[PDB]
C-alpha cells in the first residue's frame, strides 16, 4: 500500500470514532464481552498513538515499513466496511441473527485479531516484526528458510511456499486454508498469523492433515465465532449433555476454546493446556464431555 503519513492516521482515527458512535446505539444491545468493539477501537487508537509517539522525527522510517502500510490500509478498509454495513443494513442491524448483525460480530473479531497482531509486531510501540518469535521450532524454520526475516507476505506468495512442503490438495482447500489463517482478512499472511495457525494446528509434521481433521471435516469447528456465539449456539442442545463445539480463543490467541453442555445443565467453555486439540478432544470424548459435535450423534474419530 501507499506510504503512511500523519494525515492518513488522522483519517483512520476519525473513521474509528464514527464506528464507535454507531456501536453505542442502545438498539444494538452490544454485550461488554471480548471481542468488544467499544474497547478495541479506542485501544487500537491508543497503541497507534504509542507507535507514532516512539517514532517522533523518524516518521519517514515508520511510513515506509511494509507491515505498517498493509496494516493501516486494512484498518481504514475495515472501518469503512463497518460504516457501510450500518447504513446498508439499516434497521436490520438490531434484529439479532440477521446477516448484517452477524457481519458486525465477525468484524469485531477481526478488529480483535488486528489489535493483537499490531501489539505483537509493535510491542512497546517499536517495530520488531523482523525479530518476532515463531512458537513452534519447525514452523520457525519454514518461515525463515522461505521468507527470512520478513514480517508479512502476500497470500499467493505464502500459499506457494507452503505448497512445496505441505502439498495443498485443491483450489477449494486452498481457499478454506486462507480463510482459516487470514485472521485479519487482508489477503496477506503476517508472521504473527502464521504463528497462531501453526500453534493451533501443530504438529508441523502433519500440519495440513491436522487442520483437515480438526476444521475442514470436523462439524464441531466454528470459524470466526465468539464466546457469546458459542454459548448461544449450544442453547438448543441444553438438554443434550455432551454436545460440544470449539473455536479460536479470542483473548488467548493461539489457543483453543471448547464449549460444551454438561450433565447438570451448564454450558461451559474451557481452554485446553499442555495438550494439542487432538488429545483434548479424544480425552473429552472418553470422559463423556465431548460426545456430539455441534449436537450431531456421530463424533469424528481422530484416534488415527
Amino acid at each position: 500500500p501507499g506510504t503512511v503519513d500523519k494525515k492518513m492516521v488522522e483519517k483512520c482515527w476519525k473513521l474509528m470514532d464514527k464506528v464507535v458512535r454507531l456501536c453505542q446505539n442502545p438498539k444494538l444491545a452490544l454485550k461488554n464481552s471480548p471481542p468488544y468493539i467499544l474497547d478495541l477501537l479506542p485501544d487500537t487508537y491508543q497503541h497507534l498513538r504509542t507507535i507514532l509517539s516512539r517514532y517522533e522525527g523518524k516518521m519517514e522510517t515508520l511510513g515506509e515499513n511494509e507491515y505498517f502500510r498493509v496494516f493501516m490500509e486494512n484498518l481504514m478498509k475495515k472501518t469503512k466496511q463497518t460504516i457501510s454495513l450500518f447504513k446498508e443494513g439499516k434497521e436490520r442491524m438490531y434484529e439479532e441473527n440477521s446477516q448484517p448483525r452477524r457481519n458486525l460480530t465477525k468484524l469485531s473479531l477481526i478488529f480483535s485479531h488486528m489489535l493483537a497482531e499490531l501489539k505483537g509486531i509493535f510491542p512497546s510501540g517499536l517495530f520488531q516484526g523482523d525479530t518476532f518469535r515463531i512458537t513452534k521450532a519447525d514452523a520457525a524454520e519454514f518461515w525463515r528458510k522461505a521468507f527470512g526475516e520478513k514480517t508479512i507476505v502476500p497470500w499467493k506468495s505464502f500459499r506457494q511456499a507452503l505448497h512445496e512442503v505441505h502439498p495443498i490438495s485443491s483450489g477449494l482447500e486452498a481457499m478454506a486454508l486462507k480463510s482459516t489463517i487470514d485472521l485479519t482478512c487482508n489477503d496477506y499472511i503476517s508472521v504473527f498469523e502464521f504463528d497462531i495457525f501453526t500453534r493451533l494446528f501443530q504438529p508441523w509434521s502433519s500440519l495440513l492433515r491436522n487442520w483437515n481433521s480438526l476444521a475442514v471435516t470436523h462439524p464441531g469447528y466454528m470459524a470466526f465465532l465468539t464466546y457469546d456465539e458459542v454459548k448461544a449456539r449450544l442453547q438448543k442442545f441444553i438438554h443434550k449433555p455432551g454436545s460440544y463445539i470449539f473455536r479460536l480463543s479470542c483473548t488467548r490467541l493461539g489457543q483453543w476454546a471448547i464449549g460444551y453442555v454438561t450433565a447438570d445443565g451448564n454450558i461451559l467453555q474451557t481452554i485446553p493446556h499442555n495438550k494439542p486439540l487432538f488429545q483434548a478432544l479424544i480425552d473429552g470424548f472418553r470422559e463423556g464431555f465431548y460426545l456430539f459435535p455441534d449436537g450431531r450423534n456421530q463424533n469424528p474419530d481422530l484416534t488415527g
Partner: peptide, 9 residues
C-alpha cells in the same frame, strides 16, 4: 469496559 468471558477448568 469489557468484562472477561467466563472460562472454566
Amino acid at each position: 469496559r469489557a468484562v472477561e468471558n467466563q472460562y472454566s477448568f
